[PDB]
Curated annotation (Swiss-Prot), chains A, B:
Belongs to the SID1 family. It comes from Homo sapiens. The keyword Protease does not apply. In vitro binds long double-stranded RNA (dsRNA) (500 and 700 base pairs), but not dsRNA shorter than 300 bp. Not involved in RNA autophagy, a process in which RNA is directly imported into lysosomes in an ATP-dependent manner, and degraded. Residues 1-267, 313-343, 402-411, 509-513, 566-594 are extracellular. InterPro entries: SID1_TM_fam. Keywords: Glycoprotein, Membrane, RNA-binding, Signal, Transmembrane, Transmembrane helix. This is SID1 transmembrane family member 1. GO terms for molecular function: cholesterol binding; double-stranded RNA binding; RNA transmembrane transporter activity.
Amino acid sequence: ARGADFDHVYSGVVNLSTENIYSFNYTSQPDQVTAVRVYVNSSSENLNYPVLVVVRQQKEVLSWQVPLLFQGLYQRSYNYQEVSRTLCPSEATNETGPLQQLIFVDVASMAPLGAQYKLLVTKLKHFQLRTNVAFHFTASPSQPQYFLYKFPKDVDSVIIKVVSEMAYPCSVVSVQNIMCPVYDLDHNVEFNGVYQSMTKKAAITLQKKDFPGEQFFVVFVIKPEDYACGGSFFIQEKENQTWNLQRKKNLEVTIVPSIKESVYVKSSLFSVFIFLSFYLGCLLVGFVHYKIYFWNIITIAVFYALPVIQLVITYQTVVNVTGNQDICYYNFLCAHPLGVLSAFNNILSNLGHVLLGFLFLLIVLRRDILHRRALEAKKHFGLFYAMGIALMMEGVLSACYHVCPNYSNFQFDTSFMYMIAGLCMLKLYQTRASFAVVIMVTVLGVVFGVWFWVIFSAIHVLASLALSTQIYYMGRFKIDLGIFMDRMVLLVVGNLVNWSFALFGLIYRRDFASYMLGIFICNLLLYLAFYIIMKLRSSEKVLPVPLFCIVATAVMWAAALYFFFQNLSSWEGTPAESREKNRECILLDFFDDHDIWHFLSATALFFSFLVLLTLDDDLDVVR
Amino acid sequence: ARGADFDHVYSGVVNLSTENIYSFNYTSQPDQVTAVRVYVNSSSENLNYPVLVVVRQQKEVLSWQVPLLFQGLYQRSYNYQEVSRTLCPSEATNETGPLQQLIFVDVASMAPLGAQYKLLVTKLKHFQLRTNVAFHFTASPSQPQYFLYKFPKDVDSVIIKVVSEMAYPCSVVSVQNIMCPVYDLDHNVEFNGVYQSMTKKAAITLQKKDFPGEQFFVVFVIKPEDYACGGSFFIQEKENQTWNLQRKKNLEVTIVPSIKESVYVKSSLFSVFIFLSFYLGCLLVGFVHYKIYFWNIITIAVFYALPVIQLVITYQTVVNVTGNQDICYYNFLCAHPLGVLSAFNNILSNLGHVLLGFLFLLIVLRRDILHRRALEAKKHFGLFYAMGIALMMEGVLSACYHVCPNYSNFQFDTSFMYMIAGLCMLKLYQTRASFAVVIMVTVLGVVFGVWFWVIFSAIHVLASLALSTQIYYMGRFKIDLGIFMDRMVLLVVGNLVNWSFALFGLIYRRDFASYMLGIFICNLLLYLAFYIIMKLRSSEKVLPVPLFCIVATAVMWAAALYFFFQNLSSWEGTPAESREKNRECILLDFFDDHDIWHFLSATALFFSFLVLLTLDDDLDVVR
Ligand SMILES: CCCCCCCCCCCC(=O)OC[C@H](COP(=O)([O-])O)OC(=O)CCCCCCCCCCC
Ligand SMILES: CCCCCCCCCCCC(=O)OC[C@H](COP(=O)([O-])O)OC(=O)CCCCCCCCCCC
Ligand SMILES: [Zn+2]
Ligand SMILES: [Zn+2]
């Protein structure tokens, strides 16, 4: 047992009867944290006779073999010559007395000849992380690495933001508590904490009350292959891998505090008040100037929404109790928990639809009962009731989706929109197969899909425009009277550019039902535009209220499409690849780009409903 | 390094400078499998200075400390004095040469005084399991234990049936492949295989083509606490646990072969032909003796069914790629995979509804077009179309549920049944709030819930009967003419016994919406019975066809309720508790008790629809 000292390299040879033993003695003072770390190298001509390293402490035995062997799932084998590990630090309890620690390193091998090794044992100068500072380091599949963070006294929540400038190697960031065994191995990290897979970015939101002693270990473990991440192997770090394989991942970790509760309250107030301003405005506009179908739709909506609410409640609970944060595809850099929600901002963000489709229901209902008055006293208002309920249910089902976004959790709100569309077109056509033509398309490529997939999209986007035009030709009360054609070719160019942008899987742009519904809405609004143009072709004066509504529709739809094209996350890929697109909060420290889309689409879709409703007021005199 | 021999106990004392070393030399012949195992005991006055045991082999280092420490999640601590482990066996390759193996056991401790220990090292006489024999053994949290199974050459699938006669300790049964990292620790078993939690029963279905070399390791790992199983701790094995804690789980494992493909084909044929016999019979019966609502319902059904199909497809894929078999609550003892299905029998079992509700649609449609003939040439057939579509969609959504049964995966088919019920009652009442009264109940206690929960059920079951009677009074074309009351009190006793049989642990046994729908159907059929009795109270002759149909309805509903009361699994509990109720296949080596319920309810529910349809033929002359 050599009285060995730190920071000094020891070379050695071990055979079947050598058993080299080093003894490292050190001390640790109350406040500081020591965190000894052990590096051992071998030379890899040991592969059938590895170098067996055993680190003995007062209460722990850490064994490993050097070369480090890894089994890749396609019957592949990797070995690492450099193996490094940090021993569980035990600090002297505050203001009580320093602790004298003694560590033993036994190096053995069962080889008919020698086995070469090199041993270094250091103390980590920067074990502990600071509350707002970036910290740079490297890790490897064989050299995992963890650090300690101590919560301050006036901080009750933090975000661990880990960033790497290169996608591979695929890594794991877990958050263990301070308890001796640290699980820092490929088969250990996913056991006893919260963890996130990571290619380029990761962000874990920790509360203070979830950690006894108000401190934790953040652990970085580099996987041997990139399959949970996508490319299934990647080594540029070391070109010759059997020679010296070092999947060296460079990391920077910053532990940022979180937003105070004042941000919560003032963003909540901002949203609710900026949408009740529509109420307080329409009230003044309307007062200063002085069915069976409906209940069918509500019965359908309630019993479509209930199982989805239960589903996402279960998903959220599972993600809470398990440390697996690869189930929900959040924007982990703007995701604020309130209770169990874990992303409350992009749920509150759907306040738009729920409030504004209901104000639209009030508007249509007032118009309708005033018409009933003027009729029994001496329009397809069911369609507008359907429109309002579809807005409110997009809001509801979108909040349910944004409880936990998955590859199984979407497809519910878009299916409800398809259902409401089909029901409206049945009730429209009865008063006046293309309906099923969309149903056969929205069900065939639901889960179907290069070139053979292209004709699938090119046929899909075309059949959607036809179903939208065949839908609108029935929904325009003056469809034939208005047109009684240069734009008809121009709209075909809009749809032909729409289809040609879909193509082989994507040309550039994913989710089949959602894409075809986007095409549906685009063609519907473009038909509305063509109808406005044909109204202006005649000398029919557009009243000031639909004037403001069409101006606002165009403006709001531009400002909403901008934020529709952000894509801060995607369930299309692995969780670690989704997680590398999300960025910070742009508005009020609380809302990301997708939340400004849930506001501006619920505002732009309400102004378009209003345009379509209150358009033909100039006919109230031309009966 | 003592030349030490097997099966002999060595006592010893180690201190800061002793480092006892034993050397065990043995040999291994080509065919046989050795599987050395190491037992080490300490005396537990070592708790701050454990006994550190290191087992060195030619290619592996197995370290542990003795006392074995365990952290229970509620800040609890357990220690185990006896620690036993089986070393990864490496067999001499067949017919090539025996292998001489050498094992080292280093026993150390850093104690100012002695540390007592005892060491035994044996060879496992029965490491390998046989293809049809039961094998009894014991395991403990500190003495995990695994065995090797080699597939025979004409067996391509097996079921590992593990049984224990006592619920706790909660255990894990995993199936690793033969590679010397064997993951047999609490933080290892769930990493690299298929695994099942287990209290009393577990059954894992392995294919031969999923194991290179056609053999595997089955690993039994006893958890330190029973939380993934329910009771959060349980030790009767050792009353004084800090003294000598031994959560000793007694296990018996049997590796049974599987059913051949002939069973698949003949059970599939049995089902399809026993249901096409209804076609081949009604054809002879009918030939030897010589709407907007509909498409609304189909549009609702398709777009309610699509997202659920996608959801359960995703669940099944997740369970396939992950080894976690605690996601789906199957009957693991009758669960036959075909492709990715993993339980094909209880999906094929839902062939009843899909075939028989569609034959009912054909019957109602023939009746309807013959009525159209006899009318334009010179009943609420929409309700019967709804009935047939509800049967077919119960079949479809039930198969989707039985792809992967969860606590998030039910609630979809029952919500569709509620939706169809509500739509039918709207369309019925319009031609002639209690509808919403059930909607408020079927939504309040959806996720609400002792005594305060009792009045919840007692009010729920009552409000369901009222909604069913208020539904039937509208659906009986001769509701008032027939009754123009002793059974009305007797039916109240049926409902009063129905509601006083809820209100119990939660509700005298699980799911609120499903229970209230069962009450709904019970009251509907009982109203049908009361109506038959009132028809017979008058001198109105019941034709022979409704005669056979009512006899068959009663018989089939008795024979179906018997199997409704089996409960082979339950998502109401943890997976390991579900798994302890499932039993073997009763019919044709392929169908369990729940599959004979999917046959006999789809047969009994069709005969009741037929009774209700063809009942009032004796009025075709009394118009
Ligand atoms: C038939 C009438 C009654 C039937 C009602 C059925 C449809 C009613 C409209 C409500 C549809 C709706 O809510 O849109 C939902 C999606 C939003 O999906 P997500 O990404 O926000 O989850 O919205 C979109 O995906 C829109 C994407 C692009 C739309 C904007 C393009 C229009 C811009 C100007 C035209 C060029
Ligand atoms: C208004 C007409 C249109 C309404 C549409 C719905 C009407 C019924 C059609 C479909 C009914 C149905 O599918 O029952 C589903 C459930 C089965 O659920 P599961 O356990 O099998 O997954 O079945 C049950 O849970 C039934 C439970 C037992 C009830 C039968 C007992 C009757 C015995 C005789 C009287 C005591
Ligand atoms: Zn969204
Ligand atoms: Zn079933």
